[model samples]
Target: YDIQAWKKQCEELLNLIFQCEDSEPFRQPVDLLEYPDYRDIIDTPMDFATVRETLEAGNYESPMELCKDVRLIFSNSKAYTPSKRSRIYSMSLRLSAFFEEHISSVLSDYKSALRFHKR
Candidate 1:
């Protein structure tokens, strides 16, 4: 029931994703030349740094809330990369699956809430 405990676990959880291979590309917003489909959208680029800062700054309300951006990052990359078979796409696929197994590692209660909400 401790928010601080939740916060601490989130930090660790985020760190795990940040350390994942090929993760640097997601740390910042990709530009138009690199991501034209982004379509002149300014704030729509969900990224790792944005997710981390928002969480680290205590701006997010829950582990699941912060989890969305991490999911968004990989999902966005997979959708917008060169193609389904591109290097980036495979990386996204690998990392996306990897996150699911551990997103709940340090916070079973938070993870429980995710399932509770889903259920």
Candidate 2:
């Protein structure tokens, strides 16, 4: 019966993950080629054309859907050999820290908004 927490969490997650200015929907095609294993990350047959199309669209049906995509990309960053993963993985950690800090303030704002809405 209580959709408040669920709604808040979902909105917070979506805003934190997808709405970030630095949250890239897809990495550069050239960078992706470094890992042929995941060249088909955005689409099958591993072509830049498909990747470009998907990246340009920036489409998502729901916050949950976006979460899935985020997880997949994050996973891809770590799927390569340890030596090859440093760049992407390091970038991922930095972005994660950014979201952690940025989202803390946003969460407080969300709490404030929820309190106001309850009145």
Candidate 3:
């Protein structure tokens, strides 16, 4: 759910994309790096409920239209990661942008990207 997990999973998927046998193990995604819950989290430009409705209604263009505000959510995060350039801001924006571009495909693709059920 954070950058570390993202890079790991994306890399793992990339490796698999190339049909790399035993290139690396599938790393898990954990909520260890401090994340914002619904309540505590703020600056959320696009409401998930709204996005959900758009997707359910087959609104493919909504993401592009909403991308600017959605990007603001991450680009406005208050937290900071020393290794990251903009901390969660950029990370959130990329994830949001991805969601916008691939709303319908995101549900399944996102599961693969997530490392939940970590050990």
- For each of the candidates, the C-alpha root-mean-square deviation to the true structure, in angstroms, is 4.1, 8.1, 15.2
lDDT of 1: 0.73
Q: Estimate each model's TM-score.
A: 0.76, 0.40, 0.26
**Residue 79 in candidate 1, Cα distance off native in Å:** 2.1
lDDT of 2 by residue, 1-119 (tens): 23234334544554455544445533333354565655554342222233334434655333334344445554555554266446656766666566455445544655566667786
After superposing candidate 3 on the true structure, give the runs of residues whose Cα lies further than 4 Å from its correct spot.
1-49, 57-63, 78-90, 93-119
Question: Regarding TM-score, does 1 or 3 come out ahead?
Answer: 1
lDDT score, candidate 2, position 75: 56
Candidate that would win on TM-score: 1
Which residue pairs show backbone clashes in model 1? none
Per model, how many backbone clashes are there?
A: 0, 0, 2
Cα-lDDT of candidate 3: 0.38
Candidate 3 Cα deviation (angstroms), residue 117: 48
Best-to-worst ranking by lDDT: 1, 2, 3
